[PDB]
Amino acid sequence: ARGPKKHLKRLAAPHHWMLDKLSGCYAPRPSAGPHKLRESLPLIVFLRNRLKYALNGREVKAILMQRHVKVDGKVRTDTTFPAGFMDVITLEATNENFRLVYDVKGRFAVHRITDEEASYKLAKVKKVQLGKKGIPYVVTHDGRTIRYPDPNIKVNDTVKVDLATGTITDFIKFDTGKLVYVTGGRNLGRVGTIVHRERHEGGFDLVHIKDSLENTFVTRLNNVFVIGEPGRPWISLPKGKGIKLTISEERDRRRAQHGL
Amino acid sequence: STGFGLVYNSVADAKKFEPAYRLVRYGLAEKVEKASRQQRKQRKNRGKKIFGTGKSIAKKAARRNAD
Amino acid sequence: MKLNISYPINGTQKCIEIDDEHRVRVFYDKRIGQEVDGESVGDEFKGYVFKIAGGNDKQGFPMKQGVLLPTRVKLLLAKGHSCYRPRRNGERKRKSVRGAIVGPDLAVLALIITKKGEQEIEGITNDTVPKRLGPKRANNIRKFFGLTKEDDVRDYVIRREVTKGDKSYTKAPKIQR
Amino acid sequence: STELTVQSERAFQKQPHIFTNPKAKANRKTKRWYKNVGLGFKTPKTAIEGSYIDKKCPFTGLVSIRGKILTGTVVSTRMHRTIVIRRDYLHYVPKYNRYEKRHKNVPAHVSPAFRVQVGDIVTVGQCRPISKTVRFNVLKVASAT
RNA sequence: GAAACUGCGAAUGGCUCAUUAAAUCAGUUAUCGUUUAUUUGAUAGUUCCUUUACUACAUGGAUAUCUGUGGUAAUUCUAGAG
RNA sequence: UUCAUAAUAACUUUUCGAAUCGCAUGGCCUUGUGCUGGCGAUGGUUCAUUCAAAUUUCUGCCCUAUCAACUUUCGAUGGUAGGAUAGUGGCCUACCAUGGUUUCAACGGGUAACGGGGAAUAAGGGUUCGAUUCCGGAGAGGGAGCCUGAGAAACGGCUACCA
């Protein structure tokens, strides 16, 4: 009761942050923004714990003030901005570009993108609604609203964005026999080609999905995210390529793959 | 043994970014002498009591002696 | 008892002590914000026209006007009406306060002195103190000197030259707007 | 379950923001509007041809059906435009490895299109808070003789 | 740049288990039954009211801080004027 | 969907529609101190999104018959019509209708009862505990009542009465 809550205890924080149990009572609450509390990833975790440049949160505040971080083009000097899925993080010093794509386990991966391709962002829909003066405007699932779309763009259809200028480039339709990423639940950070869709009467849609190894799995509709034609990825993907392996298969690889 | 060393580029860069207590131990910057935690906390409360400034109340001190 | 006298035009104030009752008996049954003659008060003031508007009580109860009665009635106060400085924005506080009409209970009486009389006293009507702060805004500096538009500004500014010991550097306001 | 009188109140009742045009000439007189309930249901013609208004009716009103679709047999009938569905079920007991039988009743609002009696199955859908206890509305009466 | 005016925060954190037995609570739902500072996104030619003498090249007066005149056995009590 | 949105008819003691400020001082001159122009702050209207907040569907609780009938004057259960509310609702009134829960244990009593995630013991089943490091809910000596703010019946804020 009584207003909002402006704290987060460390055990109560979500697990895919990969914070320590010891060496701290609290965890960094990500502020309000285009991504939700669970699905986001704050910049304290990215700089301190992932890249491992800064030793503690003190030194993250020094880097932001002078002054090369650029989430989706613009700067952001906030320590806990909710940076999430398909967001581009660049650095002019070191010439490094990144993208927050999910790992086969479910964690956020440190994926080094080309200069170059870090330039367009991929987002989803959402609405699909008219404003005043009969103006059609589209909304992105990952934050923004964009104006004047193509007449044939509908729900669950992905859209490419210019990032620097902020306009529509291209779109893909949600149909059978196309690549699709998963961003929610147990089958998180997997890629597949789609087969069937059970529509249902006001009780959540489902999708049956294969992969290159011919292994079937089922997921909800809202977790699903389109990613181009089959065997034709629009975005560069990390090693693994959303296959997901057995326990005993991964044991076979590590002890075999040796070379000091 | 296993340390944890940091080699900066220059002197002016290494002075500002490194914590103040680390500059004291090597003998780079001066040691910042300050008041004790108890007495400056009392100063905050006593400063709050008088709406202030100290001029108006001090001039009344001469007048209050006559009463 | 004490009389808080203050001349508005000249800008000088002084407390006059009165032990005698007969001098204060003119103010008996008179309300806050009315004109009073100087001759009936005493020998010091003759020809003056006093202006009673305010007061003070024994123990320490500042008098508020519009209350009526010769009584100490506790009132509910807030931001908008006097006899209370709020610390929290919107908070109220029930304060004690002295009534309006004057009796034999007071320590000090508030008095403004409009018109002069005969005996100009030491440093209440003789001396004339200038006002501390000068003008500032665009049309306050214009109307004080009677300039209008085409005369322009950046001319009629007070530059006080204070000296620590050797130097005599200037200060200056900042004409906003 | 009054019923029949059409208008018999202190006030008068009409469908809100639906107008009978005075100057225009047609057989209608009474101007009816009716809604499609959705979820693969079928709206009867007793609602379309009828004279009742009802604020709380899902066919002719602002009451939108959403959420869950329960069922069960009818028991109580003796008040104006509501019904009490008795919904029987089992409950587990891990200690003995057996089952129970439990009771609690479900109150619901009836549309005057549907004709209801005691001891008949009634499919029922969730809606806005209609009243104190009644949170549901009737969508079927499949009384097999 | 002390002091005070304006804005923001002080409704979070911390502590305790007195009340409470379909209440609280746990898992599942719906808000097509409503409010939301802050957040990052978009976004306002339409106020003129007959269209030949209308503030729009920029309008008004206070109030603080401080100058002083105080009362009080008392307290972050606040009265008079400039 | 009486949804999004658009049009006609007017209303309103007519909300808003920038009288705000720092670091730079450029470009063609209609060479005025004018017509244009860079880099960031701030405020603003409706529609989104986020942080949330309100109510709400379904199933689940420890003993007691030396508690078998219980609620409806003073709203109990339902209908119509208003009032209030940020918004639904007997939440509140007016005129009606007599309903609702009950041996599948209501209603009353007791708890040395805050609810869960859990802990203790350990063939399999189960017994007993959970004030307490995480999540949700109550309360600031006991009861009512409000002001300011987007958000408070706030208590390291206020107005009473009883200690």
From Swiss-Prot, chain C:
Protein name (record): Small ribosomal subunit protein eS6
PTM per Swiss-Prot/TrEMBL: Phosphorylated.
Entry's Gene Ontology molecular function annotations: structural constituent of ribosome
Keywords of this entry: Phosphoprotein, Ribonucleoprotein, Ribosomal protein
Gene Ontology terms: biological process: translation
Similarity-based family: Belongs to the eukaryotic ribosomal protein eS6 family.
GO cellular component, as recorded: ribonucleoprotein complex; ribosome
